[PDB]
């Protein structure tokens, strides 16, 4: 009953973003500004979470899964810098006002040459309505996102816009994911790795991570 | 059924402290060495609390309502400062090394004069291997707890004393109840209210809380 669930969140100053049926009967996985909450059908009880599916080899984090669902819907708004021969794919929360994000982009060619595809999402450290947020908003709204981003990091102005992209979505998901500084790397499985890493170290890091992750 | 929940917990190396019912169908409230968790009846899903009953006027921490059993189990290890005309009863996790806990205690009579009974439990912000933990262990083991606590707060001779009171128990219940800094107030309904409040502010707060609850 999405209805009663919302009245409850309302009577608490909590806004819902995505409500999906939870792995447990009578409960729904709710994404809110207060984190992922598990609420009963009648909206009478709220369990903090996270939720783990322990019916198996190792625990499956239901909250992580839900946040990756949101990540999936944002793929259409990510600025993708693909590697000729894609070995790894990482999602980076970046701020065009962050010196380390500058460096990262300035090395985008090396990251790609090493098989690393970088997918950007905006994350204005100074929050919404900040100069950074207002400039990225223009970048993510341009025709060619890759080109617009390149120009701004180059210093060149970009042809602004009024599109359907809302940085707040990126920002809120980043926060939800544990982001706080930039750049922040998010891995395929949802693992967050704050900080900038030079190409060689990044490649080395991702290779080792994939080995450990797959037991090799 | 219980067998399913126990198989799940055993799988993660968790010693079930007790399997109680839950206000949510299909699951049980489970008090464990790791604290309170909610596990479905088939043991397939685990949800870390706390759980809130939000059907009423204000949210209620049902996990804290449940833990109140553990809290009331410590009634004897409490340093109680009874109010002559008891009108409110609050349990406060305090730290004798905390500036704000000292300012609160210093006004104990005022609180007691406003009809508030204060029951103290030990909470060493710095952990189990600390002076705070060592000092409160002595206080809580004293012949006269109230007297001991008063002396220490005033920087007097902290008499040597041992007994079977485990400060870790107070510390664990407080962490589970949501305690972070001291002083932290726990209401008779399990509600945690962090922070210091002078006798007046406090009294008024208790009155408004009580009023806007029972109806």
UniProtKB/Swiss-Prot annotation, chain A:
Its annotated compartments are:
Periplasm
Intrachain disulfide bonds: 98-101, 141-163
An example Pfam family from this entry, by short name, is Thioredoxin_2
Descriptive protein name: Thiol:disulfide interchange protein DsbC
Q: Which family does it belong to?
A: Belongs to the thioredoxin family. DsbC subfamily.
Q: Which GO terms describe its molecular function?
A: disulfide oxidoreductase activity
Q: Name one GO cellular component term.
A: periplasmic space
Q: What is its main location?
A: periplasm
Organism's domain of life? Bacteria
Which InterPro entries does the UniProt record give? DiS-bond_Isoase_DsbC/G, DiS-bond_isomerase_DsbC/G_N, DiS-bond_isomerase_DsbC/G_N_sf, Thiol:disulfide_interchange, Thioredoxin-like_fold, Thioredoxin-like_sf, Thioredoxin_CS, Thioredoxin_domain
Q: What is the lineage of its organism?
A: Bacteria, Pseudomonadati, Pseudomonadota, Gammaproteobacteria, Enterobacterales
What is the purpose of this protein?
Required for disulfide bond formation in some periplasmic proteins. Acts by transferring its disulfide bond to other proteins and is reduced in the process. DsbC is reoxidized by a yet uncharacterized protein. Also acts as a disulfide isomerase.
How does it associate, per the subunit comment? Answer: Homodimer.
Which residues does the UniProt record annotate as the domain Thioredoxin? Answer: 16-211
**UniProtKB keywords:** Disulfide bond, Periplasm, Redox-active center, Signal
Curated annotation (Swiss-Prot), chain B:
Name the Gene3D superfamilies for this protein.
Disulphide bond isomerase, DsbC/G, N-terminal, Glutaredoxin
- Residue ranges occupied by any Thioredoxin domain in the UniProt entry: 16-211
Against InterPro entries, the record matches this protein to: DiS-bond_Isoase_DsbC/G, DiS-bond_isomerase_DsbC/G_N, DiS-bond_isomerase_DsbC/G_N_sf, Thiol:disulfide_interchange, Thioredoxin-like_fold, Thioredoxin-like_sf, Thioredoxin_CS, Thioredoxin_domain
Q: Does the keyword Disulfide bond apply?
A: yes
State a GO cellular component annotated for this protein: periplasmic space
Q: Which domain of life is it from?
A: Bacteria
Which molecular-function annotation in GO is an example for this chain?
A: disulfide oxidoreductase activity
**Transmembrane residue ranges:** none
> What keywords sit in the KW lines?
Disulfide bond, Periplasm, Redox-active center, Signal
Which cystines does this chain contain?
98-101, 141-163
Q: Which compartment or compartments is the protein found in?
A: Periplasm
Family label = Belongs to the thioredoxin family. DsbC subfamily.
Its assembly, as annotated, is: Homodimer.
Function statement? Required for disulfide bond formation in some periplasmic proteins. Acts by transferring its disulfide bond to other proteins and is reduced in the process. DsbC is reoxidized by a yet uncharacterized protein. Also acts as a disulfide isomerase.
Q: What is this protein called?
A: Thiol:disulfide interchange protein DsbC
**What's the name of its gene?**
dsbC
């Amino acid at each position: 009953d999405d209805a009663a669930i919302q009245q409850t969140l309302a009577k608490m100053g909590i806004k819902s973003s995505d409500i999906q049926p939870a792995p447990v009967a009578g409960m729904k996985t709710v994404l809110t500004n207060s984190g992922v909450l598990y609420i009963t059908d009648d909206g009478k009880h709220i369990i903090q979470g996270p939720m783990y599916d322990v019916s198996g080899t190792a625990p499956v984090n239901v909250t992580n899964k839900m946040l990756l669902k949101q990540l999936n819907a944002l793929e259409k708004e990510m600025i993708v810098y693909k590697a000729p021969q894609e070995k790894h794919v990482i999602t980076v929360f970046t701020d065009i006002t962050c010196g380390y994000s500058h460096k990262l982009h300035e090395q985008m060619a090396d990251y790609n040459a090493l098989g690393i595809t970088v997918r950007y999402l905006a994350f204005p450290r100074q929050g919404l309505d900040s100069d950074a947020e207002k400039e990225m908003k223009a970048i993510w709204c341009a025709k060619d996102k890759n080109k617009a981003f390149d120009d701004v990091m180059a210093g060149k102005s970009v042809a602004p816009a009024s599109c359907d992209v809302d940085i707040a979505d990126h920002y809120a998901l980043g926060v939800q994911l544990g982001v706080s500084g930039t750049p922040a790397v998010v891995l395929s499985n949802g693992t967050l790795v704050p900080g900038y890493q030079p190409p060689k170290e990044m490649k080395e890091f991702l290779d080792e991570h994939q080995k450990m992750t797959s037991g090799k």
